[PDB]
Design a protein around this ligand. Structure first.
Ligand code: BU8
Length: 154
């Protein structure tokens, strides 16, 4: 019982792009760009489509960097999030009704205003490591349990 999601981090040598979600699930937190994968669509194509929809940016090659499974207690469906990174984009970031993008210097990543799991795996992403993670949440603020390990193959 899991549903496929994508998450894309535009990670350049000295900065990373995050977007402040304005409505819906996760509103009020900085995050990467992504969403649900459609019927008949590959995961990577879904990741590329959602980056465009939410940030206005065009990506070519996306690199697989992680898989994170999210459980919310009392909710049947697990979220199976496929995480990707890219350093080469086209376009400039677009603020819309749904998302406000902003660049962050790597020493100024706003962890207090991000999902709490990011403190665990974002440092791996910044050092070009790949990972498998699992986070069990109660509500949107409390991590009850988690696992996280580095992998050679996502
Ligand atoms: N970073 C992050 N994104 C998430 N989306 C849904 C649930 C938990 C999440 N943690």
């Amino acid at each position: 019982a899991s549903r496929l999601y994508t998450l894309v981090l535009v990670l350049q040598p000295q900065r990373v792009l995050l977007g402040m979600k304005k409505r819906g699930f996760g509103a009020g937190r900085w995050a990467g760009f992504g969403g649900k994968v459609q019927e008949g669509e590959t995961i990577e194509d879904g990741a590329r489509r959602e980056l465009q929809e939410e940030s206005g940016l065009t990506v070519d090659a996306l690199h697989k960097v992680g898989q994170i499974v999210f459980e919310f207690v009392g909710e049947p469906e697990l979220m199976d999030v496929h995480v990707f990174c890219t350093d080469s984009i086209q376009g400039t970031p677009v603020e819309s009704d749904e998302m406000r993008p902003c660049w962050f210097q790597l020493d100024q990543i706003p962890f207090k205003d991000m999902w709490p799991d990011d403190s665990y795996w974002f440092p791996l992403l910044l050092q070009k490591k790949k990972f498998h993670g699992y986070f069990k949440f109660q509500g949107q603020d409390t991590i009850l349990d988690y696992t996280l390990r580095e992998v050679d193959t996502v």
